């Protein structure tokens, strides 16, 4: 997910502009739900995943907000000492303590029911047990016990009218989530929220700790330690699930890293390119970053240096000159299925070959398959999420930086060979693979574009619509599942705020029993594809002015 927030010193014709593109995958009906709430201290407008009670994206006329996932490390695993002779107990601070346990029965349509037990210790539910070592692993979340309060913090923050009131609700959201602020006076801010553990000295948060007592967390770190900034000297805040701040540690996932190669730099270059931006220019950053190859920038210098002494008829060189003439923006041909330039297919083949020669080779099987993906892997339906730089690519980037990288190269990934030789050998593999399928004339190569599918199954794999309700879009766009923009104090209108969004396929998912589809079932679908947007109304006059229908209820509790 990405977000750029532009303050007073960088905005043109307004005092603040927030644009947010939360990436959750693409679904039918729509992952988020649009809703305006007017009453009981609330006066809000926006859209929110699964219609939560609190609006994750929206504004209240004074301040606006948005989120991206934070990816801090708020989960650790405790290795609990069991005993062969007295099951159900575990050793904690010198005594043998009984586990909590509950029985569950799974009813099954046209099958037999299944019952099983769930186990829990002071550190959390048991994920898995090793009978051979008499070890049980317990997953311990810093937020455990605060799930409801975090839902309420996201509801109450919609009533805040300034930074001080808003950060009092941010201090209660315990999940690892970046939160963002903008207001009518042009202030902007950011908070990496959540509850993080106050670990004992010597605890390395990437690996399990013994649960017998000495490694137990001390508590939770204070809200003062959460990375946060208000009105930054740059004039803007940009994030694409990159690191919040210097020296902050990331989630312990082996596939997740914050390194010198990161896709947020693509948003930074566009916002640093222009001294000020208008709302239309802030919205047009969606279209550029959606179509931008993320590995060109990273490895084009290494390619250029390697092939610099080659002759013009060497095909390894031709492949790098094609890449050098390209800006890395993918565009569909008129056929609706192949891209205009072959650059991503070249980088994909080269990078697969490079990883297989370098990182993959240094790691024992079967852990080598964790570092072989190039980042371009998809199927016919297209990517299920955002594109990113693959972990293997981030590790390869540190290795091609040489002693310019701060990470110590314990193993040499190039195994004694000069970098250039490995780069040229992978480029030989790329020419062999590509020219065989397309031929030798690079200029007529018509390589396959990625497409985008609005799936009928939700993120868990479970159907939320019939299979025929799947929607397909010809161009894959690396963008938010919804996009929403809020503009504060526009010089071009008399309204204090303007806001827009797009919720595709549409607001409603309803289909009557005779098969008649709601009128608002797919009226935002073509708007999504063309980068269009619709106005979000807040004030009573605007709402009445655009009303389509009205329903009044009389109810007593």
């Amino acid at each position: 997910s990405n977000m750029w927030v532009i303050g007073k010193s960088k905005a043109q014709d307004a005092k603040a502009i927030m644009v947010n593109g939360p990436q959750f995958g693409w679904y039918a009906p729509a992952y988020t739900y649009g809703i305006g709430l007017h009453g009981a201290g609330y006066d809000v407008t926006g859209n929110t995943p699964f219609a939560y009670p609190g609006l994750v994206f929206g504004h209240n006329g004074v301040i606006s907000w948005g989120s991206t996932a934070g990816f801090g490390d708020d989960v650790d695993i405790f290795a609990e000492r069991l005993s062969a002779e007295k099951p159900g107990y575990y050793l904690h601070n010198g005594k043998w303590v009984k586990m909590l346990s509950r029985e569950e029965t799974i009813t099954v349509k046209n099958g037999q029911a299944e019952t099983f037990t769930v186990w829990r210790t002071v550190h959390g539910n048991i994920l898995q047990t090793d009978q051979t070592t008499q070890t049980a692993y317990a997953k311990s979340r810093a937020w455990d016990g605060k799930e409801v309060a975090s839902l309420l913090a996201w509801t109450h923050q919609m009533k805040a009218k300034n930074w001080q009131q808003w950060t009092q609700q941010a201090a209660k959201q315990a999940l690892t989530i970046n939160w963002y602020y903008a207001d009518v006076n042009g202030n902007i801010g950011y908070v990496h929220t959540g509850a993080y553990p106050d670990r004992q000295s010597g605890h390395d948060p990437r690996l399990p700790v013994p649960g017998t007592g000495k490694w137990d967390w001390k508590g939770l770190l204070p809200f003062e330690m959460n990375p946060k900034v208000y009105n930054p000297q740059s004039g803007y805040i940009a994030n694409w699930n990159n690191s919040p701040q210097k020296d902050y540690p990331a989630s312990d996932l082996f596939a997740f890293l914050w390194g010198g190669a990161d896709r947020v730099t693509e948003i930074d270059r566009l916002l640093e390119q222009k001294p000020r931006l208008t709302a239309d220019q802030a919205w047009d950053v969606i279209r550029q970053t959606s179509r931008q190859d993320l590995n060109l920038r990273l490895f084009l210098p290494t390619l250029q240096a390697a092939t610099s002494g080659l002759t013009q008829s060497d095909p390894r060189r031709q492949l790098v000159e094609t890449l050098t003439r390209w800006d890395g923006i993918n565009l569909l041909n008129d056929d609706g299925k192949t891209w205009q330039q072959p650059g991503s297919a070249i980088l994909n083949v080269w990078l697969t070959s490079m990883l297989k020669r370098t990182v993959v080779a240094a790691v024992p099987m079967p852990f080598d398959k964790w570092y072989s993906a190039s980042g371009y892997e998809t199927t016919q339906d297209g990517p299920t999420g955002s594109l990113n730089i693959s972990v293997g690519a981030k590790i390869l980037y540190e290795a091609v930086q040489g002693d310019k990288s701060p990470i110590p190269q314990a193993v040499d990934l190039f195994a004694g060979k000069p970098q250039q030789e490995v780069v040229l050998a992978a480029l030989e593999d790329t020419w062999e693979t590509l020219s065989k399928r397309y031929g030798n004339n690079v200029s007529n190569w018509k390589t396959p574009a990625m497409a985008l599918t609005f799936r009928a199954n939700n993120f868990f794999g479970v159907p939320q619509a019939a299979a025929e309700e799947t929607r397909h879009q010809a161009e894959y766009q690396n963008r938010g599942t919804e996009n929403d923009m809020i503009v504060f104090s526009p010089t071009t209108s008399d309204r204090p705020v303007l806001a827009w969004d797009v919720v595709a396929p549409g607001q409603s998912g309803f289909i009557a029993p005779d098969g008649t589809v709601d009128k608002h079932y797919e009226d935002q679908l073509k708007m999504y594809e063309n980068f269009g947007r619709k106005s979000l109304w807040l004030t009573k006059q605007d709402v009445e002015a655009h009303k389509e229908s009205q329903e009044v209820l009389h109810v007593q509790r």
Binding site: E104, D204, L207, L253, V462, P463, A466, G515
Partner: protein, 206 residues
């Protein structure tokens, strides 16, 4: 009027809720959700509680098991039992609103029941506050704030120690999965602040 809830929909069908207290306000929200997204909400309810197999059968029994092993329902109910009356009203108003439309649907299904309920062979059930809370837990906390691979990290580290020996296996683990990298591009610039904690990097817990 304190009893009145006015629901206005705009030209894209987006609903705006005008009500005088908390319970009435969330009740109208719940009600338009049930009108617009009932099958989707019901399937999300079964997905976040592991009750998919009851309506879709044997292919979802492992899914349902995995969902129920990942939370402790009595802990969420204890949290809802401690709310104040104003906080509780958000959750109960939302479920009561949903329920008002579900009762009308279940009373006039020939015109009101979403087609997919007939396709998949089942009908909607009434909601309680616990079900609303569990939609957020299941799709927000469990999707985006529950990530760990610590156990797999250890298996990797063990394999690197076998291959390169004990101190060297550790240093290669730090090259593939560093703890921090000082050149990562950051949302907050270094002139503004840096994180103060320094962590152990040698698996010192062993």
């Amino acid at each position: 009027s304190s009893s009145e809830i006015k629901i206005v929909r705009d030209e894209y069908g987006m609903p705006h809720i005008y009500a005088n207290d908390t319970w009435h306000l969330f009740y109208g929200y719940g009600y338009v959700v049930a009108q617009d997204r009932l099958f989707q909400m019901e399937m999300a309810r079964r997905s976040t509680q592991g009750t998919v197999a009851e309506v879709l059968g044997k292919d979802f029994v492992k899914f349902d098991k995995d969902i129920r092993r990942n939370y402790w329902p009595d802990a969420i109910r204890a949290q809802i039992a401690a709310l104040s009356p104003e906080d509780m009203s958000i959750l109960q108003g939302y479920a009561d609103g949903m329920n008002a439309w579900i009762d009308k649907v279940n009373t006039n299904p020939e015109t009101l029941l979403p087609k997919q309920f007939n396709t998949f062979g089942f009908t909607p059930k009434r909601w309680e506050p616990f079900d609303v809370a569990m939609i957020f837990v299941g799709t927000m906390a469990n999707r985006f704030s529950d990530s760990t691979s610590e156990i797999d990290n250890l298996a990797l580290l063990t394999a690197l120690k076998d291959k390169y020996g004990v101190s060297q296996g550790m240093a290669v683990f730090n090259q593939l999965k560093w703890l921090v990298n000082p050149s990562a591009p950051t949302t907050i610039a270094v002139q503004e602040s840096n994180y103060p904690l320094k962590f152990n990097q040698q698996n010192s817990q062993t």
